[model samples]
Each structure stands twice: as C-alpha cells, then as structure tokens.
Target chain A: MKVSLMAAKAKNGVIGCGPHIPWSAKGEQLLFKALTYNQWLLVGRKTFESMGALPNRKYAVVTRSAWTADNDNVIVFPSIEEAMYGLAELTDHVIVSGGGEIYRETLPMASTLHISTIDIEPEGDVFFPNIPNTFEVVFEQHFSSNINYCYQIWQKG
Target chain B: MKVSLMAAKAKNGVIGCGPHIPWSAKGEQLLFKALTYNQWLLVGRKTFESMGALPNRKYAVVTRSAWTADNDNVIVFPSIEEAMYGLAELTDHVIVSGGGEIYRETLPMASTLHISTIDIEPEGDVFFPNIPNTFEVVFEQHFSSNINYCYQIWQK
Candidate 1:
C-alpha cells in the first residue's frame, strides 16, 4: 500500500497557532476536499476530532485511549503502526492528515508528499517538519488569487 | 536607486548556526559570485568582516564602530540608512548580502529578493525572516546537483 502525507503550511513552516490554523484560504479548502475525496484518512485523535468524520471516507484514527467508533467509517487504534495495519486491511492508499505530531511521526514512512506553500506568515506555534533530501519534486504550480499559494507533489527517491 | 536582498536558506528558514552558515554548497557560491559580480554590496559589520572585500566589487559596510576603510573599494557607514545614502551616491543598484539581522532590517526597503532555497535542514540558531505577502515570484528553477536547491527571484 502507498502512504502519503498532505498539509498546507505558511512559508515560515507554520501549520497551526494553538488549536486553530492561522489562515482561512477558501481555495485551499476546496483543493483539499477534491484531493482527498474517496481516500482513507489516517489522523491523530485530536485531528480526527477537530475535522470529524466526513461522508464517503474511511478514517484510521490513532489514539491511546480505548475509545469506540460511533460509525462504520471510523476505526480507532492505539498507535500509527496499528492504524496503518488496520488501514492496510481495507485500502490500497492512505493519506496521513495531520496536526504536526502525526506528520513528523509518519513522514519517514511516507512515499509521497502533497504540500501547499502558503504565501503569508501569521503567528503560529506548530510547524510542519522539513522535507528530507530523499524526496524530489515531481510537479509544482503556483496560484495567484485572493491568497497566493503554491501546490507541489514530491515523490520519495 | 534599486535595492535588493540576497540569501540562501534551508526549507526550515535557518540561515546560520551561530557565526557560520550551517552548510556549504559550492554551486550556490558560484551562483552568488556570478550574480553579485560588479554590483554594490550592502552588508552588516560582521558579514563584511567574515567575507572581507572581494575583487571586482564595491562595498557599503554598515557598522557601529568608528572604523575606517583600508581600501578604496570599501566604505563604512554607521547605519543602513547612511549606507543606502552612501551607496546611492555611487551606484544605481545595491544588493543586500546578509547575516540574518541585516536581512530583517533591510527587507522592508528591498524591492527585489534573490533567494536560494536549499533542500535539507541542519541545526541552526539564526533564521531568515519570513517573506511578506506583497512580493510575487518572477523566476524559479530547481537544480539537482550534489546538493539540490531552487533559485528564485521575487519582485515586489
């Protein structure tokens, strides 16, 4: 199975400020939805709670607590490894959605990166980890809109 | 007079680890020399001292000490504003080579940014200040040599 990581970060590497994202770029959200439409999402417990479960999507929510899933689309695991194992039982591709910690944990194992580089810098505490040298840029395109951003896809070498 | 800022930074924004740049990519230096050749350079005191005076170029060194230039190619100023004024007297354009603090101080007044985005991140203390929203990318190209990097020119 192919594992991928996806995130949108400011040019300064900032991903979040406290529990909230620092910017609201509507175009970015639309792009995110379009990309992750029918994919299996792997996320940390806090991330899963913040975004909730969306329709036509399966979730492998990583948590330490013995929490039960309320719906068939949601599955709980104690760790990312177990979540990956659970996800492998069902899906061929999994997108690791994040809240910083999860991204760092899964980055080493991820084979693909879907990154959005936001143009502005706002105050933020959480930052996305830097991409390693092993990945090479396969595709990149810049967007000039109400909020400027660049979208890039990187493949691990 | 046109003002420009030039810097090479890691993806994580780090520019230095104490007094030294964390990594050395020879291609980047070659590119730097090619771009800054025959251009007036504006730099902080420490940066000026570290790099010294190079050939085929003039310098506008910003410092607090009452230092004197040993050569005709070097000139010392007490502040960036004074350096700008001094540079304007002789040259039509000035490139702001940095040491982090100098970059942050002069970034607001700069109309152009010559940025080299290095691929890997090393441990560092001094970071490049985040780019503001007003600038637009005019040119960008990736290089995959021994150390991969992307050179981009941003115009404000």
Candidate 2:
C-alpha cells in the first residue's frame, strides 16, 4: 500500500501554535482543497474530535476504546494495523493526518512524504517529526509567487 | 527538564507536499515566528540539512554519524537520551522539530504539546503522529481574522 504524510512548517520549523494556525482563510481553503483528493484518511481520536466531521471520504479514527462515530464513513480503530485493515481493499494511497501523536506512530508505515516549507517563522510550540534517512527525495516544486515556500516529495529509498 | 512535542497539521492532517508549504508566505511566516520561543530544539540530521543553518539557538542533531556542524550552537548526538541530557537543565521546554524520525523517537518524553490546526487541507505525504488520551486539553484558541485556524495546548 502507498502510505503518505504531509504538513506545512515555517522557516524556524513551527507547524502550529496552540490549535490555531497562523495562516489566512485563503491559505486554509487551498490546503483543504488539495487534501480531499485522497481515498482514505487516518487520524487520531483527539484530532478527529477536534475536527468534528469529515465528508466525501473514508475516515479512520485511531483510538484505544470503542466509540461511536457520527457517520458511517467514519470507523474507529485502536491501532494502525486495524486502520490499514479497514482500508485494505482501497488503493495504496492512505493519508495520515496529524495531531502529533498520530503522526509519530504512522511515519514508519509511510512510503512517501509531502512537505511544504514556508519562509517565515512564528512563535509555535508544535512541529512535524524528523524524516529518517530511509527516504529519498523524488519530486520538488516551488511556488511561482512565493520564493520562500516550496513543495517537496520524498519516497522510501 | 521538560520535553514537549509540537507540530502543525492541515485540518486533514497533511504535513507537506514537495518541500514548500501549501499555505502562503505570510501564513508560514506567522507559524515560524511561534517556534522561536523554544530553548532547546531537537531536529533530525536530514531536517537540519534541508534548512542549511539556523542562527542564535542551541540545536541538538539526532544522528548516528559524528558530523560536525559549522555553527557552534549545534551539538550532534547519537541518541535522544544524549540530546535530552544536554538540555537537562533547561526546565523541560525542549521542542522537537521535524523531517518524522525525531518526533517518533521523542514523543514519549514530551510533557506538553501545542498544535495549530489550519482550516484547510493541503496535499501532503508525511503527517504529524497521533497523541493518545493520556494528554489533557489545557487551553484552545480560535482565530477567524486572517486565517481560519485553531490553537490547542495539551498537557500530559
């Protein structure tokens, strides 16, 4: 299966501050539009709760306890294995979303990574995990308007 | 000393696309500025390599090799313990920065976490890890002006 991870960070490596992002609405809308193309999404229970609901895709919630989901598109799993099993028949593309804990657990299973590097730094307390040497850079693209931000893709070496 | 893990994610949990962020430069700059308050920054060798160099901060590079950094502020260590030892006196505010491997190794050592939730989702392949129920939500703030994002602080 093709598993992938994604995130945006600042020059000083700040991914977040509290639960709020530092970007404008236009940025957020652009980011969301890009993410919904995936067939399935894997996230932590807390992150799921924080998000409220997801639409138009299969949602897997990683949690220890059995809980009810608001929609049939959502299923809860205690482990990555279970989540993967739930989506086993789907295409290889599984997207792991963040909250810190979920990202840390799923990186080992991911085969590729899509990272967005922003130019400026903000006072943030949370950040993305480091990438191990096992991955190799496969694709790269820089935004035409913004010199400081670039989109880079990496795959397992 | 207190170690904390922090990260930002698309509302959908995407980490990145190519190397560039999905957000605008102004949005990115705001997030970067928030990261500067950390006293100790822990990063993977690859992450450090990607950025070239950062000034005015003490950095611990988690690497297996004995690499020499041009900056005197950087100290390379073979393990997370060694890195934590270097920051043992800092009162537990060490921040774990990315490329995936570093956050996975140090997630257990963190006492608190601050997360920024952008309103939109970007196309990313790598993601921030999961936090379990052991963490308690301490505070949350929502920003609706420039960006539709939320900030959450969690304590373990």
Candidate 3:
C-alpha cells in the first residue's frame, strides 16, 4: 500500500490560521478534490468535522476524545498509527489529508507528498513541515491565477 | 530609481541561521551574482562584512556603529533610509541585499522583489518577511539541484 500526504501551504509554511485558511485560491481547492478523489483520507478530528462528509471519499478520523461516527463514510480512531492500521485494511492507498498536527505526525511515514505551493504569505500559525532533503521532486506544474499556485509531487529518494 | 529587494529563503521563511545560511544550492549563488553584477547594493553592516568586497559591485553598508570604509567600493551609513538617500545619488537603482532586519525594514518601500525560494526547511533563526499580496509575479524559473530552487521576480 502506498501512503501519501497532501497539503496546500504558503511560502512561509502556513497551512491554516485558525478554523479558517487565511487566503483563498479557487484552483487549489479544485486540485485538492481531483487528487484525493476516491481515496480514504486519514484526517484529524478537527479537520474531519471542518470538512464534514464529502462525496466519493472514505474517512478515518483520528481523535483523542470520544466521538461517534455518524455515517458509514466515517470511522474514528484513537491515534495516527491506529488509523493507518485500520485504513490499510480497508483501502490499498491512504492520503494523509491534514489540518497541521496530522500532517506533522504522518510526514515521516508518508512515501509521497502532493503539495500546492501558494505564493502569498498571510497571517497564520498553522504550518506544513519542511520538505526535507530525503524527498525529491518528481512532478511539478505551475498555474497562474489571482495568486500563483505551483503543484508539486515529491517522492522519497 | 527602481528600489528592489533580493533574498534567498527556505520554505519555512528562514533566510539565515545565526551568521550562516543553513542550506546550499550552487545555481542560487550563480543567479545572485548574475543579477547583482553591476547594481549598488544597500546592505546591513553585518551582511556587508560577511560578503566582504565583491568584484563589479558597490556597497552602501548600514551600520549603527562607527566603522571606516577601507576601500572606495564601500560607503557607510547610520540607517537604512540614510543609505538609500546616499546610494540614490551614486546609482540610478539599488538592490536591498539583506540579512533579515534589513529586509524587514525595506520591504514596504521596495517596488520589486527578486527571490530565490529554496525547498528545505533547515534550522534557522533569521527569516525573510512574508511576500505580501501587493506584489505580483512577473517572472519565474525553476532549477533542480541536490536541493530544489525556484527563482521569482515579483513586481508591486
């Protein structure tokens, strides 16, 4: 099974400001949907609730506290490793769709990274972890919009 | 005169780790030299000393401390504004070559930005300021190395 982590981050590494992302880019959301479609997403409880249930995706929501899975589309796990273990049984591949802490926790184990690099640096505390030297770029494409977005796929080298 | 700011930064915003850059990319240095070849560089005292006297460039070094200009290639100033005033007379354009605080101080007045975006997030204390939304990308080019580097020229 191939494990992947996907995120959109500012040049300064910001991913989220609070409950909301500080800036909006229309193409980035569309790109996210295209890539994560039909994949089981391992997300934090906060991110899962924030996104709710989306069509054509299965959820493995990680939470430290008690929570009920409202639908068959959702399942709850106590930790990241446990979620990965559970998701592995259900799907051949899993995307670590994140809110920040989830990305940090899963980055080490992830064999591939799909990233949207947004140009603007707005106020935000949440950040994606640095792309370490261990990973190398395998795919890249640039898109111009109200803001510039660079989509890159990095593989562990 | 076109006021421009130029810097190399990590994805995490880090520009320097104490006195040294945390990562190295060969092409990034070559690109820096090519772009700043004949431009008068407005730099902080620490950065000026760190780079020393380079060929084909004039230095307007900003310092709060007393220092003597050892060569005709260099001039000393008390503040960033004063350096800008002095350099404006010497050259038609200036590049705000930096070491964190200088970049932060001059970012608002700069009309152009030449940035080298490095991919890794190594440990560093000093960082470049966020590239604001007011600026738009006018040019961009990417180069692959042991570490990936992207060069961008942004205009405000």
Candidate 4:
C-alpha cells in the first residue's frame, strides 16, 4: 500500500511550536483536504487529540495500545506497523499525518511527501525530519507576495 | 582594543549575493548605527568601494597596499593585523565591517559579533565565517515583515 507524509515547516525546518501549527496557510489546508479527503489517515494520539474527529476519511490514531476513543470514525492502532496492516483491509493507500515524532518514525514508509515550506524561519524547538536527497519534487507552488509560502509534492525516483 | 564583526546570513550560512548584502532590513540598519558611531570601521576593499567613506568614523579599508581615495576619513591597510595595530593609536575599539573575505580573515581577533539573522535560508555564494562557540548572545530581537529576522549581538 502507498503511504504518504504531510507536513509544513519554517525555512529552518521547524514543523511544530508547542503543539501548534505556528504559521497559518489556508491554501495548504485546502490542498491537504483535497489529497486526503477520501484516503485513510494515520496519525499519532497528540495529532488525533488536536484536530479531533475529521470527516470524509478514516482516522487511524496510533497509541501505545489498540484502544478506540473519540468517535466511531476513529480507531487506535498499537503502532505504525500494525496500522499499516489495519489500513490494508480498509484502503489502498494512507496519509501519515503528524506532530513530529510520528513523522520521524514513519518516514521510511512514505512514498510521497506533501510539504509546505513556510518562508519565515521562526525560532522553535520541534522540527520535521529532513527531506532526503533521494526524493524529487513532482509538483511545486508558491503563495503570497514579498513573503511567500512554498508547497511541494515529492516522490522517490 | 575591542574588535567587533558584523554581517547577516541565511540559515545555511550564506551572507551575500555577489558584493551586495542580498537582503534588506531597516531595523538592523538602525541597530548597526546604535552600536557603531565615531568608531574605527575596518572593511575589505570591495566593501569600502561599494559604500565609499564615512563622515565621522575612521575608515580603514583593507587592501594589498596602504592607500587613500574617496575621503580623508578613508585610509587603506594591507592586512587586518596592521589595521588593528593602527587602530590602537586612534580608538579604544573597532568594528570589523564586511564583504565575505574580510569577515573570515578577521574572525580570530573579534571579541564581539553583531549579526542580523535573516529568517529565509536564501541561495547565496558569499557567507560570514562560522561564529565560534566561545561567544554567547548578549542581545537579540525578532523583527518583522513576517517575523523575518533575529538581530543578535554575540560576545565573549
């Protein structure tokens, strides 16, 4: 099954600021919605807790144990590896949505990357994993005026 | 005598685009003025040619030969060491102004650093020398356009 990663980061490679998506990009939000609306979403407990129940797609929240919470739409998987097994029965592909640690853990499984490169490099403690040289950009778009946000889709060669 | 260095760079450490400063910051300009006034300003020949001579400060432009041009305030020194030696008789401190090569050469002598950190990791070929670990931030500020910079002063 094809698994993808979705994230946004400052120029300095920071993806989180104290559990917050510090820089807002409505365009990126819409882009994410378009791509993941009908697909399965694998996320960590903190991410599941932050955004809560999302409509239009299945939610596979990863926790220490397989315990379901929130709503019928959400299911808990003990680990990312186990979630992949659960996902095979539900869908052909999955989107590995993140906080930080979850993204790092599941990076090797991702075939595609949906990234928003926030133009400004604000100070932060949390950071996304680096985009390896093996991945190539398939699509890219830039938004705003003097200050811009760069969005790109990357896939392995 | 106290010697200070000044320059801004990308996240990946690029400080210039050709001879130009590449990015602009009004707040950093103001910050630079607040720190250096009527003090010795030593810079590379390119920077000296680009900016010309100052009015009140003693400008010691570094080149292969000791010379003068632009204004009487301007004097050329063959090397960074000679300029530091010449500065002893003139002022108690000096500001090592930049243009890539000059920063790299004078880094060892610097006691303080006035760095304007541009938030964008720009594509540039020219860069400031690596800031040694011995220095610590004495002052810093997050300035705008989009929280786009950190003005920092690092000193031993």
Worst ten-residue run, lDDT, model 2 chain B? B25-34
In terms of docking quality, how is candidate 1 classified?
Answer: incorrect
Off by over 4 Å in 2: A25-32, A144-148, B1-156
**What digit string (tens of lDDT, one per residue) describes model 1 on residues A101-132?**
99999999998888999998989999999999
Q: TM-scores across all candidates?
A: 0.50, 0.46, 0.50, 0.48
Task: State model 2's lDDT.
Answer: 0.66
Query: 1 or 4, which is superior by lDDT?
Result: 1
Per-residue lDDT of candidate 2, residues A70-118 (tens digit) = 7877878778898898777754567787667777888999887767777
Q: Count the backbone clashes (under 3 Å) in each candidate.
A: 0, 85, 0, 0
Order candidates by TM-score, high to low: 3, 1, 4, 2
RMSD of each: 17.8, 18.7, 17.5, 17.0
What lDDT would each prediction earn against the true structure?
0.81, 0.66, 0.81, 0.74
lDDT of 1 by residue, B28-73 (tens): 6655664565678898878877786888678888888887678799
DockQ of each: 0.01, 0.02, 0.01, 0.01
**Compared with the true structure, what per-residue lDDT tens digits does model 2 show for residues B57-140?**
467888888776878778888888887887786434567776566777787887877677778777877667787789876544
Off by over 4 Å in 4: A65-67, A145-147, B1-156
